[PDB]
Amino acid sequence: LSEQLKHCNGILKELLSKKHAAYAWPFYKPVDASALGLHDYHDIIKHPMDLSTVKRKMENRDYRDAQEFAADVRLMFSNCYKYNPPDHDVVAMARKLQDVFEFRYAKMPD
Numbered sequence: 001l002s003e004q005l006k007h008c009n010g011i012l013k014e015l016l017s018k019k020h021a022a023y024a025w026p027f028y029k030p031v032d033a034s035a036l037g038l039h040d041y042h043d044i045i046k047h048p049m050d051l052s053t054v055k056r057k058m059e060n061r062d063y064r065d066a067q068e069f070a071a072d073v074r075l076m077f078s079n080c081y082k083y084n085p086p087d088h089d090v091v092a093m094a095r096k097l098q099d100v101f102e103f104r105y106a107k108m109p110d
Ligand SMILES: CNC(=O)c1cc(C(=O)N[C@H]2C[C@H](O)C2)cc(Cc2ccccc2)n1
Pocket: 026, 027, 031, 036, 038, 079, 080, 083, 084, 085, 088, 089, 090, 093
C-alpha cells in the first residue's frame, strides 16, 4: 500500500477496534434488509456499503488512492442518513463514527 493507503488502513482498523464498538457495530457487516424487515432498503439504497466490504476492498488492493477509500466510508454513512429518520439511534451512532473518521482522515500525510 502507498503511504496515504496505509493511513486509510490505520483508520479502517480503528473504526473496527473495540475502542468504537459501542457505536461502530451497525456498520461491521452489510445491512441484512430481509432479516431486519427493511423490505424498502434496496429500493432506497442503490449502493450498499459497510466496513467488511471496505476491508475486503483494502485487502484486495481495490482502492488505488485515499479519495476512493473515503468515498466508500462516506457512502456507508450517507446510506444511513438517507434511509433512517434523523432521530433514530443508528443515525446517532453513524454521526459518532463519522466524527472519528473525518478527524483522523483530515490528518492524511501530504
Ligand atoms: C446501517 N444500519 C441501518 O441503517 C439500520 C436501520 C434500521 C432500521 O430499522 N431502520 C428503519 C427505518 C425506520 O423506519 C427504522 C435498523 C438497524 C439496526 C440498529 C438498530 C438499533 C440501533 C442501531 C442499529 N440498522
